[PDB]
Amino acid sequence: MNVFEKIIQGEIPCSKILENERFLSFYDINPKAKVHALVIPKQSIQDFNGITPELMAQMTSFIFEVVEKLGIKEKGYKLLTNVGKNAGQEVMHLHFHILSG
Amino acid sequence: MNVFEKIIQGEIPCSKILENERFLSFYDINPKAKVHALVIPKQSIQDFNGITPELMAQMTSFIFEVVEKLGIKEKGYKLLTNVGKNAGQEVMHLHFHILSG
């Protein structure tokens, strides 16, 4: 019932960059940088506070795969996640912004 | 030889928020938010690209401890790290910015 959950469940399309049994990455429809990707856990979790360390290890691994696929790994990129509406979170599913440019 | 490495060693003082065997947190001397903390690995690592997943699991755990000590865990916060000079990294030691709303 939420925009990223809809993507996970395949209700709405996206520009998929990379996908894993536990994670999914895709382009942001309103880019804030030359390359702007989003990395999300397929599991239903709302923000960074609700991710286990074990899973963030696997996400870190997945993040390296994304930035390397995008070819910005060595050029340089920003890693960002907003925890809660007061820190600017708009969609309530854990997601990391990857920007480079 | 570098400003955060000096803090780790402990050549220059800081406003230590929390510390443990592998990580250290402290306030940023030029805040960009009401609460602005930095989380750094004591191990000599330059940026996010050079952290192992295993260690980022333990850092995630450590990050939860700092935001809860700062009392912004539930109010809301931003998590940011810059990878490389081209993404705005100024100090060349892996660090996560924790900003508050």
Ligand SMILES: Nc1ncnc2c1ncn2[C@@H]1O[C@H](COP(=O)(O)O)[C@@H](O)[C@H]1O
């Ligand atoms: N249908 C969608 N597909 C891809 N990205 C989206 C969609 N709807 C919103 N977004 C992005 O998700 C982000 C929401 O902001 P935030 O919650 O602060 O990370 C924004 O950067 C939006 O551009």
